[PDB]
């Protein structure tokens, strides 16, 4: 019944579409490419150990077969990217004989060998420039007689979803003749190396050589990609703390994956670029200065009439208010410096935020934040010096004044001495201001008083709440929490509960008028233990008899029974009552 019709681009929909969409495409494509580069940099310490191990285990071949079981994380969402990077690295510094198996394209042995020799045939026929088992050995014998016989490796992606039978037969077949064909498999264990004992019995498990590797535990992966991706000054689009709070919570509670987080950031950027007509100038500062100067005047009335700017109108004098209200030529001039102040607030914000992160991560028990992520959270939910947590840091930091604090003042100063001229121009020259405080670190009271002036100037000067401190902040900030959360992580089991228990949409139905089906479910669960059929039909008949008389009985019984059975097919259909077979009839209360 899958009937097909044959038929026989820049459509976005004020906020005019073309440069808006190009702004979108540029920003998202930039973020995605730098996301992949910052992925591949972090695993270099991991797999450049692996190239050493595989080179050592190949080169001593003149009874054994080497396995390197990776312990990758629980996130199966991003396991493709690590294997692509590892395939690239092993293809470069070691052999151009690298294949990978997926454990869904091989239920049994014929599929295993056929897809393995097909991948090997294309992998060898590209870079030199069939169900049979020993012809693969003949392929190895023909294709590589030289280059000290580079070892073929296979990459099982999921160790777990493999059946044990086909895997056991493959390991015994490969271990039978590795005289020619030296094979070094690397299965990716999703959990932990305990389960390689579980899935492989001991004869096959005894046949091989296990050397496990760790992987990047995901919290200090997402601190890097959150810290480089949004906490920088570089990317023109920031995020609200509550929307970020939603995103990092559904990371840390449910998903434990990073690709989902980038999907959430992509959705947030997309919805922001749909949302408001001032979002077009989310750029760097001269690219902002380009067409602030020429723009439609109703969007400039929108730049007047957005509420943070009307707060700025509220705080200011009349003689420039009378020209800056309506006239575009001055409105450009003040909003240009407002956008410069936005960039200014970002630039002096984030570097001293990292400075405070280094100065707070050094502490025993770290009562403010565990890591660099939550420091963004604690300085935006409550006001930070209003809150008891920075009061606890300030109470902590007095009698911590020893050489650990001075030594880590020197060390934190060294890491933002690397960030001294990596910010390269500060918005108050705070680098050499604070460095002019921080240059007396080499030469026990001085740590205390220098601490006092440093955190007071630091936190009271810039480290503040970004909406109320800054007008025109809507252009960089996207905030809609439970609009987004239901798009990203929905709950139909709550939705049917809501629209079945209270189907009140806008005339009187809140606690009998306009269901048929919520009548059936509500009357089903007015007798809330279990049910049989005919008495339930009589009870529904009674309540819509009440509906009839609050506006012959046999025709009414017929139409009531017909709309009853139309209701009860749906009440079976939607995950409630499962049919109770072989009895006279009943229905079973399957959901409480």
């Amino acid at each position: 019944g899958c009937f097909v019709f044959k038929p026989n681009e820049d459509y976005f929909n004020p906020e005019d579409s073309k440069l808006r969409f190009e702004t979108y495409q540029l920003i998202w494509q930039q973020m995605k490419s730098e996301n992949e580069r910052l992925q591949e940099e972090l695993n270099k310490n991991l797999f450049d150990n692996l190239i050493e191990f595989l080179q050592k285990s190949h080169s001593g071949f003149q009874r054994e077969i080497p396995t390197a079981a990776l312990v990758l994380g629980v996130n199966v969402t991003d396991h493709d990217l690590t294997f692509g990077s590892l395939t690239e690295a092993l293809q470069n510094n070691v052999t151009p004989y690298v294949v990978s198996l997926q454990a869904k394209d091989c239920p049994d042995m014929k599929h295993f060998l056929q897809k393995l020799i097909s991948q090997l045939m294309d992998c060898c026929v590209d870079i030199k420039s069939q169900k049979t088992d020993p012809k693969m050995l003949s392929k190895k014998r023909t294709t590589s007689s030289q280059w000290q016989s580079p070892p073929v490796v296979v990459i099982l992606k999921d160790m777990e979803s493999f059946a044990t039978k086909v895997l056991q037969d493959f390991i015994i077949i490969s271990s039978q003749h590795l005289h020619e064909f030296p094979l070094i498999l690397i299965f990716g264990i999703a959990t932990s190396p305990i389960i390689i004992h579980r899935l492989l019995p001991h004869a096959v498990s005894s046949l091989l050589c296990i050397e496990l590797f760790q992987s990047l535990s995901c919290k200090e992966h997402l601190t890097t990609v959150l810290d480089k991706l949004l906490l920088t000054t570089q990317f023109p689009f920031k995020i609200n703390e509550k929307v970020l709070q939603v995103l990092t919570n559904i990371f840390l509670y449910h998903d434990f994956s990073v690709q989902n987080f980038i999907k959430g950031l992509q959705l947030s950027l997309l919805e922001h670029f749909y949302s408001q007509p001032l979002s077009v100038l989310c750029c760097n500062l001269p690219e902002a200065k380009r067409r602030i100067n020429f723009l439609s005047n109703n969007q400039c009335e929108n730049i007047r009439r957005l509420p943070s700017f009307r707060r700025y109108v509220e705080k200011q004098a009349s003689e420039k208010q009378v020209a800056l209200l309506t006239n575009e030529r001055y409105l450009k001039e003040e909003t240009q410096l407002l956008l410069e102040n936005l960039h200014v607030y970002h630039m002096n914000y984030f570097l001293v935020l990292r400075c405070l992160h280094k100065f707070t991560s050094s502490l025993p028990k770290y009562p403010l934040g565990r890591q660099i992520r939550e420091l963004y959270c604690t300085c935006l939910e409550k006001n930070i010096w209003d809150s008891e947590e920075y009061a606890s840091v300030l109470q902590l930091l007095r009698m911590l004044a020893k050489d650990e604090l001075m030594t880590i003042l020197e060390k934190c100063f060294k890491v933002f001495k690397s960030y001294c001229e990596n910010h390269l121009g500060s918005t108050a020259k705070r680098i050499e201001e604070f460095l002019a405080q921080f240059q007396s670190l080499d030469e026990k009271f001085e740590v205390l008083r220098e601490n006092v002036v440093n955190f007071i100037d630091c936190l009271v000067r810039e480290y503040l709440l970004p909406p109320e401190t800054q007008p025109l902040h809507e252009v960089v900030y996207f905030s809609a929490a439970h609009a987004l959360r239901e798009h990203l992580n929905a709950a139909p089991r709550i939705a049917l509960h809501t629209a079945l228990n209270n189907p009140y949409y806008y005339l009187k139905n809140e606690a009998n008028i306009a269901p048929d089906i919520c009548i059936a479910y509500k009357l089903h669960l007015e007798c809330s233990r279990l049910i049989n059929l005919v008495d339930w039909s009589e009870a529904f008949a009674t309540v819509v008899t009440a509906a009839e008389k609050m506006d012959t009985s046999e025709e009414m019984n017929e139409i009531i029974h017909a709309r009853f059975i139309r209701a009860v097919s749906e009440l079976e259909l939607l995950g409630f009552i499962k049919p109770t077979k072989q009895k006279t009839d009943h229905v079973a209360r399957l959901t409480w």
Partner: protein, 373 residues
């Protein structure tokens, strides 16, 4: 390749006698069972290598399909050309007559050696009784030489077949295990001293494994570790009493850490799944033998005890259900109604208690009196 026998001479001699010379007939089919340690391909390969009876050797582990099993037999046999293709069994019996008409092997009793025949047991019902009667099926002086891990009594087709001649290859003796576990090739010591080492190690170790391969591996590991304090410190009794403290731990040790970081709701999910697997004789009501294993239990009971465990800000979102699906792919939970439906089947717990104890303790929870007591 070197030593044919290493003192298993009588079975070797009766097999060698049973082959006979080339120009007369022999048995149709010979089945040799025994343990996996017992030399069952060492003895027959070093026996066949001596006389050079022109034979084909296969493994049934390698040939997972029937066609490859016939193809490599015919292809290896004709060398003693192209791939002489055989889709079916009757093609093999057909082409076998043309293959076994060469003057190397016209009168010679050809041996089709079949190794690890228990994997041939579930290949087909056709191929094993078709292979046992090959001496008169094709009538070309053949003898199909079986050897197996398994007993013949399970191996029969339950119709009857040509019952093969059955040998039992014997296990290795204790003093024979002194002799044949490398009394030849000690490199640098006396053979008395390496024999004294392995004589000490073996009588300790003759209760866990009599497999010669892994014992050769363990002896070649723990002998240079034994050998270093003689050549460095310098008297067999003292270093006997030194080598057995290393030997107990080397026995015991031939699994990095059990702890796995998880997302927090998944931790609470399999906490709830354990707690509703291991004491669940309607003891939902009280708080809010063990040895037989996990009892299966449906999903809504798990959701109820999940709500009782967690702080009550949980909602049944899509991610909590997708997470509870995704836990089963990692085989920490198992669906035991295999197809009972998409609606919530019994999900029984399949992780060990110490792992559960560590996952419970890494989020503030002591549960052992809460779990079964």
């Amino acid at each position: 390749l070197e030593n044919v026998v290493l003192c298993r001479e009588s079975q070797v001699s009766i097999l060698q006698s049973l082959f006979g010379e080339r120009h007369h007939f022999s048995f149709p089919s010979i089945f040799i069972y025994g343990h996996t340690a017992s030399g069952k391909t060492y003895v027959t390969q070093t026996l066949l290598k001596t006389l050079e009876l022109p034979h084909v050797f296969v493994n049934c582990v390698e040939c997972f399909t029937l066609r490859l099993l016939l193809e490599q037999i015919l292809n290896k046999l004709n060398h003693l050309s192209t791939e002489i293709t055989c889709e079916t069994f009757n093609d093999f019996v057909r082409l076998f007559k043309q293959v076994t008409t060469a003057e190397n092997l016209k009168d010679q009793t050809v041996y089709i050696v079949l190794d690890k025949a228990e994997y041939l047991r579930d290949m087909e019902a056709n191929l094993l009784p078709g292979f046992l009667r090959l001496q008169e099926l094709a009538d070309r002086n053949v003898t199909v030489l079986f050897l197996s891990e398994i007993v013949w009594e399970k191996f029969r087709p339950n119709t009857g077949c040509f019952e093969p001649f059955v040998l039992y290859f014997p296990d290795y003796s204790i003093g024979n295990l002194q002799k044949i576990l490398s009394h030849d090739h000690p490199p640098e010591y006396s053979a008395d001293f390496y024999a004294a080492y392995i004589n000490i190690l073996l009588g300790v170790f003759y209760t866990v494994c009599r497999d010669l391969k892994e014992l050769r591996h363990l002896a070649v590991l723990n002998f240079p570790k034994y050998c270093e304090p003689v050549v460095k410190g310098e008297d067999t009794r003292k270093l006997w009493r030194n080598i057995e403290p290393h030997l107990k731990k080397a026995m015991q040790t031939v699994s990095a850490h059990t702890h796995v970081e998880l997302p927090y709701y998944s931790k609470f999910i399999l906490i709830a799944a354990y707690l509703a697997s291991y004491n669940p004789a309607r003891t939902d009501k009280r708080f809010f033998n063990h040895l037989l294993g996990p009892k299966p239990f449906p999903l809504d009971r798990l959701l109820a005890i999940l709500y009782s465990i967690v702080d009550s800000r949980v909602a049944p979102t899509a991610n909590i259900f997708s997470q509870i699906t995704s836990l089963v792919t990692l085989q920490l939970l198992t669906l035991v109604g295999h197809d009972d439906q998409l609606d919530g089947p019994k999900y029984k717990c399949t992780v060990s208690l110490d792992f559960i104890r560590a996952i419970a303790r890494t989020v503030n929870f002591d549960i052992i009196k809460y779990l079964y007591d």
